[PDB]
Amino acid sequence: GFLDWWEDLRSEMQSITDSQEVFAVLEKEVRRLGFDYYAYCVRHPIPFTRPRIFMFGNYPPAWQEHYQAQNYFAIDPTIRHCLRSGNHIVWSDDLFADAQELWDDARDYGLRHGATHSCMAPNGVMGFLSVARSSPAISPHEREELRLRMRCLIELLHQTLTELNHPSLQPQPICLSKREREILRWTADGKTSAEIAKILGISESTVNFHLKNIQKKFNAPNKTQAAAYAAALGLI
Amino acid sequence: GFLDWWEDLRSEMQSITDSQEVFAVLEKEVRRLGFDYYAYCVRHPIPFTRPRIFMFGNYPPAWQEHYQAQNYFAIDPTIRHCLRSGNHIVWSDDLFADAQELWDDARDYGLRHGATHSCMAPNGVMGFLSVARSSPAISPHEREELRLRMRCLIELLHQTLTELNHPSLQPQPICLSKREREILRWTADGKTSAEIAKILGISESTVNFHLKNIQKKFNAPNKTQAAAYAAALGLI
Ligand SMILES: O=C(CCCOc1cccc(Br)c1)N[C@H]1CCSC1=O
Ligand SMILES: O=C(CCCOc1cccc(Br)c1)N[C@H]1CCSC1=O
C-alpha cells in the first residue's frame, strides 16, 4: 500500500550518493504517478527583484529552450512566491489567466495536464515540483492521492539534495552573533540606534558599530537591505 | 489502510463548521497515535522582537500556566523559527540542552516523551504541532509513520482553520499597489529614492510619496520596518 511505497522510496533515496541518481529516481516515480514529465524549481527569496532560481527536470528540451527564450519564468504562476491552499495546484485555464501566452504555448508542446506542489523551508527557500502529461485529464478521484504522493516526493527530494549539499539549496551563507541578531530585530521593528541603545543599555556608538558589521556581512549599502534580507532568510 | 484513514479524516474535518470541533477531532487523533496530549501553536513572523503567537492544546492546565508564567515560549526549542531537517523533531535531552529548566519542569509535570512537527505557510506564518505522553518512549519502529501522520494532521488542521477564518491564522491585511510593491521591492534591495526614481522614470518626490503611503499601511515610522515586514509577510 501507501506506507509500503513510502518506506521503499525512503530506503531507495537514503542509499543515494550522487545528485544525478536522485533525479533518476524522481523521473521513475513521476511516471509511476501516471505522468510523462516533471520539473523541480528552487526559488531563493533574494534578491527580491531578481531572485536566484534553479531549475531542473526532463521537459522536452525544445520546451525548455522556448520557456527560456520567452522569459516565462517571470510570469509562470506555478512558481510564484505565493500562498496556495494545500501547497498544491492542478493546472487549469484559470490558473494561467494572467499568463495566457505561457499556457497557450505549453499546450502546443503537449503539456496539457499537470499539477505543481510547493514547499517552503523556514529559510525562505521554496521548492516547486511539477508533473505534466499530454492526454488524460487528472481525474477527480486521483487528485487527493496525487497531492499526498507529490508532497512526499518533494519533501524527500529537498531533504536528499540538502544532505548531499547540492549547490542549488545552499542559501546565502550569513552568520550573525546573538548581539547583532538582536540589534537587527529591533532595527527591523523600526527602532533607531538611540532607542536600541536605551533598550539594551549600551551606547548608540556600539549599536552603530554592530549595524556597520551587519551591513558588511550582507554586502548591503544600508540597514534597510540588511533587515529585509535577514527577514527573508529567516535570520531574525 | 493509511489512505482510508486520511480520506476518512478529511471528510470528517470538511464536515466541521466550528473551530471547537476541529480540536476535538485533533485530540482524538492524537490519542489514536498513542499520545496523551497535544499542542498547536501559530507563530506570526512579526513583530520580530515580540511575535504574535496563538497557542492551543490540552496540556494539563497546571503545565499551561507554569509554561506561561516562566515565559518558556521565548526559549522553547520546539517552537523556534528555524530549519528542522524534516519539519519534525522527537524530543530528547539534546534538543533541550540550552533550555534545561524547561525540560526538567516538563518532565516533572509528566511530559516525558513527544515530538513536534512544523509547517510554514509562504506568508511567514508558522504552525507547530506537539504530541506528548508520560510513559512509553517513542520507539524506532513508529517514528517515520508518526512523522507522516503528524504532517497530515498539521496540514489538515491549518487548512480547516483557514477555511473557517479562525482569527489566529488571519494576518493583518496590507493592500499594496502594483506600483507600491515594486517601489518597496527596490527599496528592500537597497536602492535609494533617487535611484528608484530613475528606474521607474518618475520624480523622487513621487517615490517618497508612495513610501510615505506604504509606511502608513505598515504603521511604520521608517522604510526599514516597512521593507522587513513586507519581506517576512511574503508581500515583496
Ligand atoms: O512546471 C513549471 C515550473 C517551471 C519549471 O519548468 C521548467 C522550465 C524550463 C526548463 C526546466 Br528544466 C524547467 N511550469 C509549467 C507551467 C505550465 S508549462 C510549464 O513549464
Ligand atoms: O510543545 C511545545 C511547544 C508548544 C507549547 O504549547 C503550549 C504551551 C502552553 C500552553 C499551551 Br495551550 C500550549 N513545547 C513542549 C516542549 C517540552 S514540554 C512542552 O510544552
Residue numbers in the entry:
A (entry chain A), B (entry chain B): 6 to 241
Paper text:
Here we show that PqsE and RhlR form a 2:2 protein complex that, together with RhlR agonist N-butanoyl-L-homoserine lactone (C4-HSL), solubilizes RhlR and thereby renders the otherwise insoluble transcription factor active. In common with many other gram-negative bacteria, two QS circuits use N-acyl-L-homoserine lactones (HSLs) as autoinducers, namely N-(3-oxododecanoyl)-L-HSL (3-oxo-C12-HSL) and N-butanoyl-L-HSL (C4-HSL), which are produced by autoinducer synthases LasI and RhlI and activate the LuxR-type transcription factors LasR and RhlR, respectively.
The butanol-m-bromophenol group of mBTL resides in the hydrophobic acyl-binding tunnel leading towards the lactone binding site, and the m-bromophenol establishes π-stacking interactions with Y64 and Y72, two residues also contained in wildtype RhlR. Co-expression of RhlR-P75 and His6-tagged PqsE revealed that the interaction between both proteins has been lost by the introduced mutations.
